[PDB]
């Protein structure tokens, strides 16, 4: 089951950060300041993807960054930066939001770390342990003794590893920008036919999530997520932040959520959500961006009957509707990982395997490795689920 690596006494934790390497200094980011938001945005756009031939890169936005970093309980002090002393330019960042997860039946207050970014010029200084140590020192002073973070590379011991999958929605666009390949002997018509979607949804009672649904989604999601070895815990205030889009001036929609109201009993029996994070096409004559949806949290009452056949059929129904709703909202591609129960539907719904991997890390906590939905060949396998029930951004 595991437990903490060290029990920490918050009165013995240093109140001042560690001295940095020669010419650099700590900073606290004020992301309500658009100039500082711009600094982080610029650092992330050019330095957050670890590989240097990436001819794609994520396009962040004020709405996305506010959604990711300003969740209930957020503090400026957990938006940490490093600046070069001479120029004051921002050269590294690590941001955390406080929440709770469960790890093999044990509930833990954590900081979920979501933009650990190091400028290309400082990768040789190996600052990752140094940033993690500093944000967690700040969390230790507030009674949070564990963290969870991710990476696209293997570092000393992921707790789990998941594979990225991609479902084209506008295959032709994806082909034109070099995102999707044309398989040998195939044709545009063949691939367009392959990825065709109905124009209407099939799940009876399906429709968009609303404020009144918060209590019911909270209960259902919590019951579903508790089934996984490592899973996110939600308060009702977190459900509303993370899942309910709020329309407002200067505000762009980041998350889409739908529920299924059973036509007879009128209870919420299913729900799913997805978020927008576009990828910039580094130069192309016709297309600037890939509008990408990422599958987020979902849940279904069918899970609790414990027969895999019925759960597969229900997820095939629900997630094909998720694809239809994304296509209706003009997304080009629908991305998902092998976590949750996703291997039950990825291949059938024509998600193609990606070369990306997401690796999960726990800080100050020891537990047995957790299955990530894939077998030893890195292929989805229903015997390797039940492990990862946290979606990190």
Residue numbers in the entry: 17 to 409
What did the study's authors say about this model?
This catalytic modification, reaction known as N-myristoylation, occurs in organism cotranslational or posttranslational processing. AflNmt is necessary for colony growth, spore germination, and sclerotia formation in A. flavus. The blots of AflNmt-GFP (green fluorescent protein) were found in the hyphal cytoplasm but did not overlap with those of the fluorescent nuclear dye (DAPI [4′,6-diamidino-2-phenylindole]) under luminescence microscope observation, suggesting that AlfNmt exercises its biological functions as a cytoplasmic protein.
By observing changes in the fluorescent substrate CPM [7-diethylamino-3-(4-maleimido-phenyl)-4-methylcoumarin], Δ1-89 rAflNmt was shown to possess N-myristoyltransferase catalytic activity. The approximate dimensions of spherical rAflNmt molecule are about 50 × 60 × 55 Å, and this protein is folded into a typical compact α/β topological shape similar to the GCN5-related N-acetyltransferase superfamily structure. The AlphaFold2-calculated structure agreed very well overall with the experimental X-ray AflNmt structure. Major differences between these two structures occurred in the N-terminal region of the enzyme, including the following motifs: Ab loop, αD helix, βc, and βd.
